[PDB]
């Protein structure tokens, strides 16, 4: 019911007095498929422990995003540390059109539409922080009407 998904695994080194000592860094995202997303980075000496420490970090770092019956509300930019993530509302887009580390964070959000495009850097670690940043700042018409207009009807035509 949480729909876990690992994205990428990278091997890093420390270069100590004895020599190179290696370590593994993972990148996982979780999400119930109804509007909640969350990522955990994680790092350990071996791959299964580096994955598992990313299992727990993502669960406690979940954020809530309101969805328009399975798609996002409006087109939005998602700039975060050289990664210019942009997505269009794509009403009934019939399949996730998204790139690397773009599909995993979106299919756990609970979507099957919207087109995506990533500009600038394509680093997996930054773009998954770019997608959540683009998702969280979005507002739906039921709370746009609260902050301005004081009416749900006239703000959407």
């Amino acid at each position: 019911e949480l729909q876990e998904k690992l994205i990428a695994v990278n091997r890093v080194s420390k270069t100590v007095k004895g020599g190179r000592i290696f370590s593994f860094t993972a990148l996982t995202v979780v999400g119930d498929g109804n509007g909640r997303v969350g990522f955990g980075y994680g790092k350990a000496r071996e791959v299964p422990a580096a994955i598992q420490k990313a299992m727990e970090k993502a669960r406690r770092n979940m954020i809530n995003v309101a969805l328009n019956n399975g798609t996002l509300q409006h087109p939005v930019k998602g700039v975060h540390t050289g990664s210019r993530v942009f997505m269009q509302p794509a009403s009934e887009g019939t399949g996730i059109i998204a790139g690397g580390a773009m599909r995993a964070v979106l299919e756990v959000a609970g979507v099957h539409n919207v087109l995506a495009k990533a500009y600038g850097s394509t680093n997996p670690i930054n773009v998954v922080r770019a997608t959540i940043d683009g998702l969280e700042n979005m507002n739906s018409p039921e709370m746009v009407a609260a902050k301005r207009g004081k009416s749900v009807e006239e703000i959407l035509g």
Binding site: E92, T94, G95, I96, I97, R103, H112
Partner: protein, 205 residues
């Protein structure tokens, strides 16, 4: 243009029954399923995100026996059509003449159905068609030609259809051998286990 090969090995690579070898014996019982697509079939590969798209795209193609060139034209026709692309693409595959006769139950397998339609045994609307990829329109009727009727192939196949799921978009009488195509199939009317979500995504790259 056809497969012409071991049409149970395609089910072993996909890990599910594709109804390529249904026949009289319901349970297969000779497949060695999920353990030998080849020499190294015991091992489980990593199956990356492009792989789950390619296996999903091939699985629907292995079922209906449609090649890549003809299947890609079906996707472009489903893209230009109004509504959901995956719904139209499954409707286009379910509207094929060789598919619908298997849905009528006149063929035990789709390959048997594809051979039956090619041999001028389908007599649709009083107009004989031997094209497997003939897109049947709603409220049409299909029948069996007298020169190919009751020749121990179809009566062995129509008695195999009562253990099937009884499609609700068509009606079969099996006494006059006249099958009608009432409406376009819906998403809930078909198998409902196939995921058309991965199908559209693969053709976008």
């Amino acid at each position: 243009a056809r497969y012409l090969g071991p049409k149970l090995k395609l089910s072993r690579r996909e890990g599910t029954d594709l109804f390529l070898k249904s026949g009289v014996r319901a349970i297969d019982t000779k497949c060695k399923i999920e353990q030998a697509p080849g020499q190294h079939g015991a091992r489980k590969p990593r199956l990356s995100d492009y792989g789950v798209q390619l296996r999903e795209k091939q699985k629907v193609r292995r079922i209906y026996g449609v090649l890549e060139r003809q299947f890609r034209n079906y996707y472009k026709e489903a893209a230009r059509l109004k509504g959901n692309t995956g719904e139209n693409l499954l409707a286009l595959l379910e509207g094929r003449l060789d598919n619908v006769v298997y849905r009528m139950g006149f063929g035990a397998t789709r390959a048997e159905a594809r051979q039956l339609v090619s041999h001028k045994a389908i007599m649709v609307n009083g107009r004989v068609v031997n094209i497997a990829s003939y897109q049947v329109s709603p409220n049409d009727v299909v029948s069996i030609r007298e020169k190919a009727k009751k020749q121990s192939r179809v009566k062995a196949a129509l008695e195999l259809a009562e253990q099937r799921e009884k499609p609700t978009w068509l009606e079969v009488d099996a006494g006059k051998m006249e099958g009608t195509f009432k409406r376009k199939p819906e998403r809930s009317d078909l198998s409902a286990d196939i995921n058309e979500h991965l199908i559209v995504e693969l053709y976008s790259k």
